[PDB]
């Protein structure tokens, strides 16, 4: 599914990301735009053999099992395929574990490089929430 900006903002708010670990909703919408272009089916193969999956490009080296990332963990205890669903539940619940682990949203390189310290409020302008 390719979400609209306000559509994803509303779903992320429903699934409890607004101010989760102190990150306003706009941080999560900005991260999803630059990670996945709001496409739940986005995948990126890394040169290390891991793959990034879904709306928040969650990586198979640590967080999900894809059966093809040798030596990897599965800390969200999910198949990576669950992170590509139209239903953002699995992505959001894993994203909550990632952002809670110590480096906060810096775990998302696109958030660090493109969203962090910017006017992230802009991403929820015009949305019903």
Residues annotated catalytic, as ranges = 35, 52
Report yes or no: 46 and 33 within 8 Å, Cβ to Cβ. no
- In angstroms, give the least distance from the CB of 48 to Na ion: 12
Interface residue with Cl ion among 72, 76, 80, 111 (CB under 5 A) is: 72
Select from Cl ion, Na ion, none the partner in contact with residue 43, using the beta carbon and a kind-dependent cut-off of 5 to 8 Å.
Answer: Cl ion
Secondary structure (3-state) at 43: strand
Tokens of 31: 């991260």
Residue 53, SS3 per DSSP: strand
Torsion angle, CA of 98/56/4/1, rounded to 10 degrees? Answer: -120
Residue number with CB closer to Na ion (27 or 72)? 72
Query: Is 101 marked as binding a ligand?
Result: yes
Q: Is 40 in the site for Na ion (CB under 5 A)?
A: no
Q: Give the number of other CB atoms < 10 A from CB of residue 110.
A: 18
Q: Which of residues 37-66 bind Cl ion (CB under 5 A)?
A: 43
Q: Applying CB under 5 A, which residues contact Cl ion?
A: 43, 69, 72
Residue ranges for the binding site for substrate? Answer: 101
Chain contacts with Na ion (rule: CB under 5 A): 60, 65, 69, 72, 74
């Amino acid at each position: 599914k390719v979400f609209g900006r306000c559509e994803l903002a509303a779903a992320m708010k429903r699934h409890g990301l607004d101010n989760y670990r102190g990150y306003s909703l706009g941080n999560w919408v900005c991260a999803a735009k630059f990670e996945s272009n709001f496409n739940t089916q986005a995948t990126n193969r890394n040169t290390d053999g891991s793959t990034d999956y879904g709306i928040l490009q969650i990586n198979s080296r640590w967080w999900c099992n894809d059966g093809r990332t040798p030596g990897s963990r599965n800390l969200c205890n999910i198949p990576c395929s669950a992170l590509l669903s139209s239903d953002i539940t699995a992505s959001v619940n894993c994203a909550k574990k990632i952002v809670s682990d110590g480096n906060g949203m810096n775990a998302w390189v696109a958030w660090r490089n493109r969203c962090k310290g910017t006017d992230v409020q802009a991403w929820i302008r015009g949305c019903r929430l």
